[PDB]
Amino acid sequence: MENFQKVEKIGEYGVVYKARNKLTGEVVALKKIRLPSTAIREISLLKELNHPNIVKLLDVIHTNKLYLVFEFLHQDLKKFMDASALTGIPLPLIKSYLFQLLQGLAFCHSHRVLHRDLKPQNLLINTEGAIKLADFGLARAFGVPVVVTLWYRAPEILLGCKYYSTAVDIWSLGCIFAEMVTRRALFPGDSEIDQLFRIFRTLGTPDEVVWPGVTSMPDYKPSFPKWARQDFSKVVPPLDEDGRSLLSQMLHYDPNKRISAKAALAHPFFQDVTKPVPHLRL
Ligand SMILES: O=C(O)c1cc(C(F)(F)F)ccc1NCCc1c[nH]c2ccccc12
């Protein structure tokens, strides 16, 4: 604030505004977070850690409040999916978007940085056909003393695992992939247990056979109902076997069997990937 002309509120960690630097004229995304050396330092390292599929962090300012200045993009995937709901996003664009998000995840995962909260609304898109990871859920992990959507949460998170791996981002991205294809949210739960049971009713209640150690998870209960796995061809029906195969590997219960971002990039689904340009109304 005061160094910036607030153009518009663009979302609610805190509130984010489209703002214009009063001197340079740069239009940016200003994230205001209401509230440590490691936190400030570790966040500040991200300014020089850049990738084309990751939102650029331009500046960090801390005074009771933490301000993060990001590059600005006009639209996100949630808006674009709503706009495309009658026709669906064309498969070459779905494929390009999935490819780029896996590139961004492979990058930050190779730097031991997890996103933890991937959702369509956090995925920024531009007129050039790019998509970028934004709104990283990094405050808790960096140690920042700061209704939540659970639809994209990995099952190990919902079952109380305290140590997330990179696999929780692959799960979320798998859910988003399915949603681009079918134009319906895959697992739209409204409570942690409702989220978990929606997952169980589709993929089957997990057990020690498919997920060793599942019955030892902190929030696992032997009284969980035992649902059979559904025919996976019901899940994303129109999608071809290349896409379905990739999706099933992204939705493995066992985080140790869930495909990595780098390995997913080599999957045969991406052999004909291109970079179409979307039809964006701004
Ligand atoms: O996205 C946010 O809101 C956000 C919030 C916080 C916190 F809440 F802790 F303050 C910290 C970082 C954030 N983004 C980083 C974006 C980024 C830039 N370069 C990267 C390289 C690898 C991985 C991520 C990045």
Curated annotation (Swiss-Prot):
Its EC number is 2.7.11.22. The modification N-acetylmethionine is found at M1. Changing L150R: Reduced phosphorylation by CAK and reduced kinase activity. The modification N6-acetyllysine is found at K6. Binds 2 Mg(2+) ions. Keywords: Acetylation, ATP-binding, Cell cycle, Cell division, Cytoplasm, Cytoskeleton, DNA damage, DNA repair, Endosome, Kinase, Magnesium, Meiosis, Metal-binding, Mitosis, Nucleotide-binding, Nucleus, Phosphoprotein, S-nitrosylation, Serine/threonine-protein kinase, Transferase. CDD domains: STKc_CDK2_3. Changing Y13F: 2-fold increase in activity. The modification Phosphotyrosine is found at Y13, Y17. It is found in: Cytoplasm, Cytoskeleton, Microtubule organizing center, Centrosome; Nucleus, Cajal body; Cytoplasm; Endosome. Found in a complex with CABLES1, CCNA1 and CCNE1. Interacts with CABLES1. Interacts with UHRF2. Part of a complex consisting of UHRF2, CDK2 and CCNE1. Interacts with the Speedy/Ringo proteins SPDYA and SPDYC. Interaction with SPDYA promotes kinase activation via a conformation change that alleviates obstruction of the substrate-binding cleft by the T-loop. Found in a complex with both SPDYA and CDKN1B/KIP1. Binds to RB1 and CDK7. This is Cyclin-dependent kinase 2. The lineage of its organism: Eukaryota, Metazoa, Chordata, Craniata, Vertebrata.
